């Protein structure tokens, strides 16, 4: 979990103009940068509670230290989700279906986000991806410095 020094460092990186404030539109990005993964719903509740267009470091610390799920806390739910989508029982999903779900349903990702995700994903000659490897990439990839 991010130390106080790591939280400050992160905040300062987001606070490009050094005025001690970061736009509320970047709160999700900043939390995510330090290994906590709010859903859109959760983030919206947090933003609504802040009732502000920007936040300071003290606030960021307070918000971040709450029990927002880390990536390992999401493994079970992700694997359950992918298993429910697994037609063949072989641990794969078609990358085309994955792209569609990410982009068109739920808390839809942007095209740019989806291309960055898929750049690191091995696709077979029948267009299949191993979803546990994908989950593993999401959970273990780019850990805290």
């Amino acid at each position: 979990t991010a130390s106080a020094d790591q939280i400050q460092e992160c905040f300062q990186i987001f606070d490009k103009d050094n005025d001690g404030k970061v736009s509320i539109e970047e709160l999700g990005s900043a939390l995510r940068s330090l290994g906590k993964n709010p859903t859109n719903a959760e983030l919206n509740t947090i933003k609504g509670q802040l009732n502000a267009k920007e936040f300071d470091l003290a606030t960021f610390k307070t918000v971040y230290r709450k029990p927002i799920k880390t990536p390992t806390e999401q493994s079970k739910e992700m694997l359950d989700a992918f298993r429910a989508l697994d037609k063949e029982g072989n641990g794969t999903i078609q990358e085309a279906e994955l792209r569609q779900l990410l982009l068109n349903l739920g808390d839809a990702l942007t095209s740019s986000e989806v291309e960055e995700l898929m750049k690191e994903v091995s696709v077979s000659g029948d267009g299949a991806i191993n979803y546990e490897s994908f989950v593993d990439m999401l959970v273990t990839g780019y850990p805290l410095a």
Binding site: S29, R32, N37, P71, D107
Partner: protein, 63 residues
């Protein structure tokens, strides 16, 4: 439907990975810039200091 709901956790974890990736890059750049800044600023402050000149002369003799 129910699919919209179950994929939200995958979307949340996917956003997390993208941001952690972006942040590693941004942090590496900021940390490196800081090291360079700190070294330049220090050097410009001590470059004509007699103790620096002496220390700099001795440095090659040190283990």
């Amino acid at each position: 439907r129910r699919i919209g709901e179950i994929v939200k956790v995958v979307q949340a974890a996917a956003r997390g990975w993208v941001e952690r990736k972006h942040f590693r890059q941004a942090r590496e750049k900021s940390v490196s810039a800081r090291i360079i800044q700190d070294n330049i600023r220090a050097y410009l402050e001590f470059k004509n200091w007699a103790w620096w000149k002496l220390f700099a002369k001795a440095r090659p003799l040190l283990v």
